[PDB]
Amino acid sequence: HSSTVQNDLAALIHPNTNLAQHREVGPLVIARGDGVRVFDEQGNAYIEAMSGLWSAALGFSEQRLVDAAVEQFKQLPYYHSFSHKTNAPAAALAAKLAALAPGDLNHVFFTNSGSEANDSVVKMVWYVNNALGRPAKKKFISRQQAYHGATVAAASLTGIPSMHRDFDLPAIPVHHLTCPNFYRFARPGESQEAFTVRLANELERYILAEGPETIAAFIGEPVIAAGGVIPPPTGYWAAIQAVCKRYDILVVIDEIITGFGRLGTMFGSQLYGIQPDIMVLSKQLTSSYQPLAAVVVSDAMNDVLVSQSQRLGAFAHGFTCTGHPVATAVALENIRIIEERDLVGHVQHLAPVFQRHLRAFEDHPLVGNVRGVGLMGGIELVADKATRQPFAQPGTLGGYVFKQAHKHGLIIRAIYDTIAFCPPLITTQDDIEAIFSAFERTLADATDWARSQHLL
Amino acid sequence: STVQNDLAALIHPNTNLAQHREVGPLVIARGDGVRVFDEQGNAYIEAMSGLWSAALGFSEQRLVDAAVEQFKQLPYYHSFSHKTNAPAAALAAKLAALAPGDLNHVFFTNSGSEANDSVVKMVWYVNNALGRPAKKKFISRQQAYHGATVAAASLTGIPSMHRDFDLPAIPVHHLTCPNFYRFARPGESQEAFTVRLANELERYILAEGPETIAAFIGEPVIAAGGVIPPPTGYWAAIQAVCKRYDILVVIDEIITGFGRLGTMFGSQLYGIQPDIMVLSKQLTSSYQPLAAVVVSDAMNDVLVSQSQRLGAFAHGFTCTGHPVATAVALENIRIIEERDLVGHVQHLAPVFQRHLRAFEDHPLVGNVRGVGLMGGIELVADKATRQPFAQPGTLGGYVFKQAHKHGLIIRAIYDTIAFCPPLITTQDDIEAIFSAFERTLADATDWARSQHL
C-alpha cells in the first residue's frame, strides 16, 4: 500500500468499477505515459490497446499537445463564453469543426463531455420542436447496446441494460431498436442486406405505431463501441436514413468514438454515407488530454435556435467551461497533428494488418466471432461455437482475460466476454504484433483457466 | 479573424443568439490577477471571477506549473476498471478530509451539472437498493441553480432555464425562494419567515407522502438566482424537517465552496451537515474542468453493496478523475490554504460589504445583500413598495453593458447586480470596483430617466 493506494482506497469512488471488489484488490496506479504505452507506479509497462477509453488518439506522451496547453495557459488560462464573451481558440476550433464536418453542419456548441453533449442534443431538439409549434415531437429513438453517456438523459439514450439497472432509466421518452448485430440476431442463412431490411422495417413499424409526429430524432454511433464493437450490417445506414427522412426525424450521429480517423475516415459518417442533422464529437478530439466535446448542428437547427432568442431572450443553456480556451487550444493542435501527419491515411494502411491479426483468432476454440472496422475490433468468446451460445455467467471469462492480459503487459477492455481493441492512431505494425502476441499468451492462459473452472 | 470565426460557427451559452449576430462577441485575450483584457487591449476588473469561479485570478502561474508537471508525467488516464492515478487519489483524500462530518467518499466529474446529475442517479440507485422504489422525488427551491443537463436543470428553479425545454423532466418540487426582502410579510421577522418556510416544506412532504421524497438540494446562498442569503435559522429548520422524514440533504457548494462566504465551505458558516456535498468552479479556479460529489459513509456503503450484486457502479465519464484537472485542483487548494485565503476573505469581507451597503440610500437601489465576498445590489422602480420594473432585466441589462465602458465586468441577474470578485482581491481592487460601479450607476440613473421609468 503506497500513498496513492491508501488514498484511493480511503476516499475514491471509481467509475464503472465493481466498488466491492475494489476494496479487496485495490487500484492499479498508472503513473507515466509513453507513446502507446503506460506505466504503473512499480514501473511495469503496458501497451494500451484501448487508447485508454477509445480516446488517446496521439498516445500518452505527445509533447505538441502539452506545448499548445502551455502556450494558451500563458495567454489566458480561463474565460467563459456567456453573455457574448469569446476567446480565440474556441472560435478557431468552432470554424475548424464547421469546415471538417460534412454537409451544412456549420454551428458548434462546446461542452466538457460526450454525456453533456448528448444531453444538450436532447434539450436542443425539444427546444427546436417547441419553437416550430410541434410540442408532441419529442421522442428519441436509440438502439439496444448503444452507449451515449451517463447523465440521466444521455444514459436514457444509452441502451446497455446494466447502465439502466436501478437508475430508473430511461427517464425521458426513448425507444430502443434491436441491436444491429448480424452475428447475434441474423436468421439462419439470412444475408446482411436482408437483415438491414428487417432492421429498417422495425424502425418504420415503430414510427407508424407511435405516430411520426411524436418522434423527434434518431441517435446512433456509426459503429457500436462500448456495446461490443458491432459494425453495422451492409446498407444499414442508407436504409435508416431513408426512413428517418420520410418521417422528418432528425438524424443524430454520435461520433464520440468514431470521430477523427478511428474507422479510416475523418468521420465514420463519411465511411457509411451518413448525412447527420447533428454530429457529436469528443475523446479523440483532444486525445482526452483535456475534457472537451462538441455538438455540431445544421444551419436549419441553428436558425431555429436563433429565432428562439428573438422571443425568449437568451439560449438558457451552458456549462462554466463551455469553450475553455485551454481545452479548445489543445483540440486545435490535436487536429493539426492528425491532418499534418495524415493519420487518417495511416489508419487506412494499418487497418488491414490490424484486422488480419484479429481474424487470425477466428478458428480458436474459445472464439465465436471476430468483427472490426478500421482501427477498432472485437473478439467474442463463447462456450459453444456451434450454437454461438454465451457462458453461464457472461463476463466471467472476459473478466479473467482483462486481469490476465496485464500480466503480459497488455491493457484491453472486456465487454462481457467480448475483447475490445481500439489502439492509438500512432500505433505501428510492430505495436500490433506486440499487442496480439501478448493477447495470444493471455488467451492461452484463458483456455487453461476455463478448463479448470469447468466452463466449456 | 477571431470575430469572423466566432460569428460564423460558434453557438454561445447563455447568450441572446439573435442579438449576437448584430453586436458580435467580446474577445477576451489575456489575464492578469483580477483583470482580463480584450483583443483591443482594454482592461476590465473581473468582479465576478468569471462565473463565480476564478478563485486565484486569471494568471496564477503555480496552477499552470502543476498542469505542466502533470502533463509531462501522464497527460491522460481513466479511472474505470479499478485504474487510478496519484493526483485524483490525493485530491479525493484531501476533499474527504476538508469536508465536514462523515463526507469521506469522492466521485469526480467535469462539471457541476454532471455532478448534480450524478447525485440524482446515486439517490435513485440507493433507494432502489434499499427497497424503496417510490422514494425518488427531489425538493429544490425557486431561483435555485443546479446546472444545465436535463436532470440538473430540472432541479434548477429559475423559470427562464425551463422555458421551452420541457423541464422539469423528473420528479421535483420547488419551494418558495428563501428571500426575506421579497417574500417576507409586512413587519415579519426573519425568524418567523424561516418558520413558515420550514412549515411549507413539512406540509408539502406530508401532502405528497414522505415515502415519495428522497432528497432536498440547495445552495447555502442562492447565487445565480440573485445573491440571496438564507433568513436567520433557515438551515437548522430545513435540516430538522429533512431528518424527520429521512430525506437526504444535498448541499450544492459549486459556488460557495472554497472560501467564498468566509469559511472553507458555506456549510460551516450555516451549520449544515450534508449527506452529500457538490463542488466545482473555485475547486480549480476553472483552470481545468472539474467537479466532485462527496458522499457520506452510509451512502457509500450502499453504493458498495450494490456492486456486490450488480457487478459495477455503472456510471462514469471519460475524464472522471483526469490527472491534469485533479493535479490543478490540488495545487489550487494548496494555494488557498498556504496563503490562508479563507482568512483573507474574513478580513476583506467587512470592507467589501460596507462598500456594497453604501448604495442602500441610492434612489435606484431597493435592497443590498451579501455574505463574505459575494454581494448583490437589487435595483427597483419604487423603494417604498419594493416593486420591480415593467420588464425586469432592462435596467440590469444596461448596467451590465455600461459597466464595460468603465473597465468593470459584473453580472446582471435581472435587475440585481452581482459581485463575486477573486479571493486574491485587495482593498485597492475593491475601491476600484465600486468607483467604477458608481460611475456605471450614475449613467444608469440618466438612462432610466430618458427611458421613463
Automatic annotation (TrEMBL), chain B:
- Which Pfam families does the record cross-reference, listed alphabetically? Aminotran_3
For whether the record's keyword set contains Protein transport, the answer is no
| Required cofactor(s) | pyridoxal 5'-phosphate
Region forming the signal peptide: none
Keywords (alphabetical) are:
Aminotransferase, Pyridoxal phosphate, Transferase
Instruction: Give the Gene3D superfamilies listed for this entry.
Output: Aspartate Aminotransferase, domain 1, Type I PLP-dependent aspartate aminotransferase-like (Major domain)
Question: What is an example of a GO molecular function annotated in this UniProt entry?
Answer: pyridoxal phosphate binding
CDD domains under this entry? OAT_like
Q: Where would you find the membrane-spanning parts of this chain? A: none
What highest taxon heads this organism's lineage?
Bacteria
Q: Name one GO biological process term.
A: biotin biosynthetic process
Q: Which family does it belong to?
A: Belongs to the class-III pyridoxal-phosphate-dependent aminotransferase family.
The protein's name in its UniProt record: Aminotransferase, class III
What is the originating organism of this protein? Answer: Pseudomonas putida (strain ATCC 47054 / DSM 6125 / CFBP 8728 / NCIMB 11950 / KT2440)
